[PDB]
Ligand binder design. Structure first.
Ligand SMILES: O=c1[nH]nc2ccc(Sc3ccc(Cl)c(Cl)c3)nn12
Length: 343
């Protein structure tokens, strides 16, 4: 239980119910690497939907019951055996308590039952960390899984801009988006409406260049990785299972020819969206498993693990590298055609 909770000193930056947001921190003095990880957990998009989430998913909406510590696992582990990539980094876990895919900038008020402050939570965590050693960082890697992976795409450039404006131009801000790269595709049997409604409910914010492309009312487009990614300036590494379980759930896939063709086309479409993403890791697996898994080291694409690919990405950011690839997308067309897929 090695990351310690800090509730935000600015108590106006709040979780959904007005309780303070916060972050869990394990410092590694001497390391100039900082990993800020955004937790996932879907979202809620209206009063009634959020009320239900408050009853049975309250930790995603409130800090009142948070534990004082959390153990870092996977990419947040400090043990080299568990985390070959960044075991010596300063570790930050930012709990998801805003239910807004990290996009919100609205307070609880006379007219708002809930606060949706995800974008402000990230900014305030960054600001408070600067006084705790982040001012000396060389790399700030903003990582996240699921809704937190989409949150990386929505926020990485805003963090880069925030640090520049605060006077820290030497800190290199980068993103790692895990399991947050979705397709606005046709369902197999019959989400974009929910995001469209959520955005209005949350006063949700999207990256400026993407906003300017899609214009008013169409900001939901920027929640889809393949549309927002090309607009981003910060280096972003994309991790995405080709057959992500949450993608299949929203596609209402739970094998006959029609479903076989559907699943094969989904993998082909996902692979196509990653062709021009030079730092990516996309195994041909059906999984919801994420990079804070203790066994995240086990999967390989073309013989290269994700910790290796991330290390090669670090080297690339110091012309492709001999034996150290960064673009790793499976080409085989069916779940678990990669033998290293999670069981
Ligand atoms: O936290 C988890 N686990 N699985 C999922 C799936 C989607 C989401 S939020 C989201 C993100 C992007 C898009 Cl384009 C849309 Cl429509 C919704 N969060 N999430």
């Amino acid at each position: 239980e090695d990351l310690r909770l800090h509730l935000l000193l600015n108590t106006s930056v709040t979780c959904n119910d007005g309780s303070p947001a916060g972050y869990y921190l394990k410092e590694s003095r001497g390391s100039r690497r900082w990993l800020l990880f955004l937790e996932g957990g879907w979202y809620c998009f209206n009063r009634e939907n959020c009320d239900s989430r408050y009853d049975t998913m309250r930790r995603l909406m409130s800090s009142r019951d948070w534990p004082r510590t959390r153990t870092g696992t996977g990419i947040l582990s400090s043990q080299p055996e568990e985390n070959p990539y960044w075991w010596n980094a300063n570790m930050v876990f930012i709990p998801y308590c805003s239910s807004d895919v990290w996009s919100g900038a609205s307070s609880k008020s006379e007219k708002n039952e809930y606060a949706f402050m995800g974008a402000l939570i990230i900014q305030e965590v960054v600001r408070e960390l600067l006084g705790r050693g982040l001012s000396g960082a060389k790399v700030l890697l903003l990582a996240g899984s699921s809704a937190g992976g989409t949150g990386v795409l929505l926020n990485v450039d805003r963090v880069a801009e925030q640090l520049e404006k605060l006077g820290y131009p030497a800190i290199q801000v980068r993103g790692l988006a895990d399991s947050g790269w979705f397709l606005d595709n046709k369902q197999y049997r019959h989400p974009t409406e929910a995001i469209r409604r959520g955005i209005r409910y949350w006063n949700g914010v999207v990256p400026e260049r993407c906003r300017r492309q899609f214009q008013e009312g169409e900001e939901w487009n920027c929640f889809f990785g393949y549309k927002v990614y090309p607009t981003l300036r910060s280096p972003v590494f994309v991790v995405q299972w080709l057959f992500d379980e949450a993608q299949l759930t929203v596609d209402n896939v739970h094998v006959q020819e029609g479903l076989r063709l559907y699943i094969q086309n989904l993998g082909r479409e996902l692979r196509h969206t990653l062709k021009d993403v030079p730092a990516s890791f996309a195994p041909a697996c059906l999984s919801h498993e994420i990079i804070i898994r203790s066994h995240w080291t086990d999967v390989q694409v073309k013989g290269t693990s994700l910790p290796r690919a991330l290390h090669c990405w670090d080297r690339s950011l110091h012309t492709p590298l001999k034996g150290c690839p960064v673009h790793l997308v499976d080409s085989c067309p069916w779940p678990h055609c990669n033998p290293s897929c999670p069981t």
